[model samples]
Target chain A: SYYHHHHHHLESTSLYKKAGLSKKIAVLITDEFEDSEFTSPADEFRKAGHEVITIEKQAGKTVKGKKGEASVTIDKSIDEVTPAEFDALLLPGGHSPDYLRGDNRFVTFTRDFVNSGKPVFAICHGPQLLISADVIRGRKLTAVKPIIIDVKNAGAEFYDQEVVVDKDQLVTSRTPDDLPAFNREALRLLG
Target chain B: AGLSKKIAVLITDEFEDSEFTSPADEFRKAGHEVITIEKQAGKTVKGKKGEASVTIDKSIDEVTPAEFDALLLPGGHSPDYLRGDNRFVTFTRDFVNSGKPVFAICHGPQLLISADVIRGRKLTAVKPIIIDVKNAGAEFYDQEVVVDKDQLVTSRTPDDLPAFNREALRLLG
Candidate 1:
């Protein structure tokens, strides 16, 4: 996995607070998330001294990665958090979004966040949640290919890039290959 | 069987498994020698999805552009990682500068982008990559495959493997 053998991208700026950017990021994910999508960005976010909160259906529970490469312990429950509680939202894709969208609580949170016009970073299958929330319409985004058709069907314009940033409110990417760029833009939004 | 060509595969960890395997197998079946190169020899690189694990046949330190007939770059996360190292980028630029054949698929062209050689070349890669491709000077396309000058063959994804392979075989022959 890429988590093992790379350097040069992780040099932290630690300037979010100084830059007047949001310091608290709410990461909404459940089981089977693409491993590095959660670990890499979360590590970067925490390294910057930002508050990185992991939210799932319940609090204090660990969820596994799709390929068994990552495990995250939840910091808060969906019911315990709201869209206004954090400065930004992060969704790491895999089967997690497919699982999360089945619960309307997750859907409502995403809808509220996107409409709140806050920075949202989603990658690979992450846009599935955005599409489910009916907020994808008219937004420019990108996701892993499987959901490309679904994204178009949901009425969002999709750009096929490693990372696509739309008006400072949303940043999306194609795959783990795009994580470096995804994390770059996401951190810029936070910073 | 046909004229035997040496295919230089520059790859590292988390490559798209099928992108590496399928075209490589096709090249080998067509009687070409496909050599896998990485930062170090004897290192086994695994696919992002864990669908394959490949041990490199050579290291960047052990090879030269003149040693191969064509350069092959597979997409996935590997290209992104490889482009960060100057050795790979230098080797890629040299190979293209030699004016021989080059085949890149999906994110494969990212290395080509880093090599600073594909300017004015007509090509296609995985969509989002078009951002850098355009910035680098290549005329980007949405077709499943694009060929320029009989010297460069590029494809969009694994879905374009058939056409991509045929064009590559044509270039090699």
Candidate 2:
């Protein structure tokens, strides 16, 4: 029951070299996706030295979102990227993922990555995609609640935690506010 | 048609807790009647992380935009779903065209875009969609919350919840 952990950085007087890890993370975003849901985690991971690959639903276009929120132009489409190329996966929330779940390629890409034992993190409604991919059944998880029934229907044990982790490769959190814990564990998972 | 001073929060499939729920509660405490309109009724609307459940105050189709003075979108999967639904989009546009306040946060703002009101407005939203606002012919601000005269008020995250709560009461009042 410790709130703080002394890392190797504390002992090393050099701040520059204490926390440097070159990790590239694949963040799947789609049209009308939640702004905070992707940026909150992507920026945190970026600051942690992880390259965030914005795998979008389409290419040569800008994704639209609410409230005059900005859209991040992605590099490639879901049809272009394969899970075998990345070290981790981040599914951002939105109704877009629901559409993505219906794509056999998306399901295959996500599940193949999971089978490879890479870290998979889905927030808000993103877990529904994992559930559709048949990757989360029997795992302890939590979501925005209405979707918990979907997780339960998929045979996963849904909880009400801000963040939940099962084994070495999965991290699920409730929302953007839970970014800190989710990011920390996601980094730890990679290590 | 006289729009009720009541606020309608759109409960999507997986809405964020701190983003929409806290502010919704604060609005209620400020003496405004709050109602939740969801895609599904006869079920509990769960917050992020099982943070809480708000019973479906009414189904979206059963409610009228003219009956609400403001529309609140709790950020989560629902807003995304709502932005795509024609019924929700029409309701939101009607609420805005009624000269009422359209307050949104985080992912909540995304729904506002679908309403087609952000084309010439000032607002704030959680960062990831900066390009979306720009392309819509709207100005994006880096502030925690942006208040556009008497029309719309937007904020980035739940940490900006108090700013939104105070402004929502002021603008909608």
Candidate achieving the largest TM-score: 1
In angstroms, the error of model 1 at A49 is: 13
User: In candidate 2, which residue ranges exceed 4 Å CA deviation?
Assistant: A1-191, B1-4
Candidate 1 residue pairs that clash = A160-B127, A160-B128, A161-B128
**How high is the CA lDDT of each candidate model?**
0.85, 0.72
- Give TM-scores for every candidate, taking all chains together and pairing residue i with residue i: 0.58, 0.50
Worst 10 residues of 1 chain B by lDDT: B127-136
What are the per-residue Cα lDDT tens digits for candidate 1 across A1-191? 53442221223564554564446799898987888888888888877667688899888788888788777778889999889878999999876886687688998999999899999999987887887787877889998764565576567898999999999879999999998999899989888
Residue A24, model 1: Cα distance from true site in angstroms: 6.3
